UniProtKB/Swiss-Prot annotation, chain B:
Pathway: Polyol metabolism; 1,2-propanediol degradation. Belongs to the bacterial microcompartments protein family. Changing K35A: Slow growth at limiting vitamin B12, wild-type at saturating conditions. Disruption phenotype: Cells do not make BMCs, diol dehydratase is found in diffuse aggregates near the cell pole; it was later found this a double pduA-pduBB' deletion. A single deletion forms larger than normal BMCs; it is not fully complemented by protein produced from a plasmid. Grows in an interrupted manner on 1,2-PD and vitamin B12; grows for a while then stops, then restarts as toxic propionaldehyde accumulates and then decreases. Increased DNA mutagenesis, showing propionaldehyde is a mutagen. This is Bacterial microcompartment shell protein PduA. The gene is pduA. Changing R77A: Subject to propionaldehyde toxicity, makes about 70% BMCs, protein shells appear wild-type but leak. PANTHER family: BACTERIAL MICROCOMPARTMENT SHELL PROTEIN PDUJ, PROPANEDIOL UTILIZATION PROTEIN PDUA. The keyword Transport applies.
Curated annotation (Swiss-Prot), chain D:
PANTHER family: BACTERIAL MICROCOMPARTMENT SHELL PROTEIN PDUJ, PROPANEDIOL UTILIZATION PROTEIN PDUA. This is Bacterial microcompartment shell protein PduA. The C-terminal 14 residues mediate binding to the N-terminus of PduP, which encapsulates PduP into BMCs. Bacterial microcompartments (BMC) 100-200 nm in cross section are formed during aerobic growth on minimal 1,2-PD-B12 or anaerobic growth on 1,2-PD-tetrathionate medium, but not during aerobic growth on glucose, anerobic growth on glucose or pyruvate-tetrathionate. BMCs can constitute up to 10% of total cell protein.
Length: 86, 91, 91, 86, 88, 90
């Protein structure tokens, strides 16, 4: 499964990002992470294509509410990565 | 399936003012506050969409007289469960 | 005889402690507690009759300003039941 | 009852130096440290008004050679609600 | 000889990309991530010095295409207790 | 026992300081403390001579990785080191 991230400045934009992403059935919300400086990351998993479309939609929705700081898809995460994940 | 309303401010004082106006202005329940650093605080309420829209408008308007409002937003119908789309530890 | 919440928000803890002590000096106001949101921002919260809370928060802000930086000062008149209900969990 | 003294520094290293200088005289009690972010750390002591005045003078004097002093303050007669934030 | 490798970013997405690139590019183990606030995130790996050097270079390069890298560093370490210096 | 401190902007510089500190002298790592603004304080303990040598080395090493904000040695803490240290570091 692929990993998708949308990172915003502001939690309100992050929640909007999350809601837009989980709107399609084959995308799973992994969780939120806060790292300070107002930066909040929403993490999802699913088929690569679904995650690409999802993160694009999440960034698109979020940018109307607040600031998008990063948008990224990892099609094939290496397995150790699952330890830093929520 | 209940709507979510959010007001995000710089500073806690403006957030508490938002919260007070939000729950005073409509039939909404205060979900909680979240702090995300850089002095930013998000106030979250839930209820029927009409109440949440009215509450959030009220919250944003009141807060601006107290501090800086950074974001204002309503999600009328969350796709996932309301407890699912929210960050842990808020309620 | 309607209750109010009064807030003084400072950058720096010493100024907040000074605000709290100055506010509770009048036998008419109760200290609810302090809240931290990071970035050096500290909010001191009191409750009591509205008039008392206005005078208290004025006095608290004035005292705090001689010690450090005040970022916000605000009074919220509140409903009879559940006056502290809008407050963040942990104060 | 007892006086309250505070030395607030930018940096933990300076607060610890402040703390060590304050507890050097025997009738001064270290209440503790508080962190509020932005690098700000407050050292809080208690004792007789005079001991606390001399203690906070000394703590600030020591701290300022290590980092920046942001606040130095004595409350000779704290109202007894204040013991809640401490 | 054992070594600790670190990539420190402003932003989490860049850190996750660094972590993934590091364990993909060399024979290193992900120890974990640390947050210190202010948006600063440190990803830490472990392995032999050569591998860690390759991993952190690759991790830093990948992270820079996603967000901001603040520091990249390799610490060669003693035989025993290599992780002892790490935060809890 | 003496206390040594190196305070940096960034965790990477702090961990580098910690490594140089323990490698350069007979000092024990007490822990790390984060105080906001990206600031991290690394604290060690040992005899004054070791702590002095360690903190100098730690500061020098950290400066190659990031910015050092404070470097300080307390040869003789008045109260035992456990009393002046913040709760949660050790
Ligand atoms: K699009």
């Amino acid at each position: 499964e692929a990993l998708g991230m949308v990172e915003t400045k502001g939690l309100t934009a992050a929640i909007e990002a999350a809601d837009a992403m989980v709107a399609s059935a084959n995308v799973m919300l992994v969780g939120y992470e806060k790292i300070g400086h107002g930066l909040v990351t929403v993490i999802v998993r699913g088929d690569v294509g679904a995650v690409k479309a999802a993160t694009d939609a999440g960034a698109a929705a979020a940018r109307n509410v607040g600031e998008v700081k990063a948008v990224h898809v990892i099609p094939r995460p290496h397995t150790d990565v699952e330890k830093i994940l929520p």
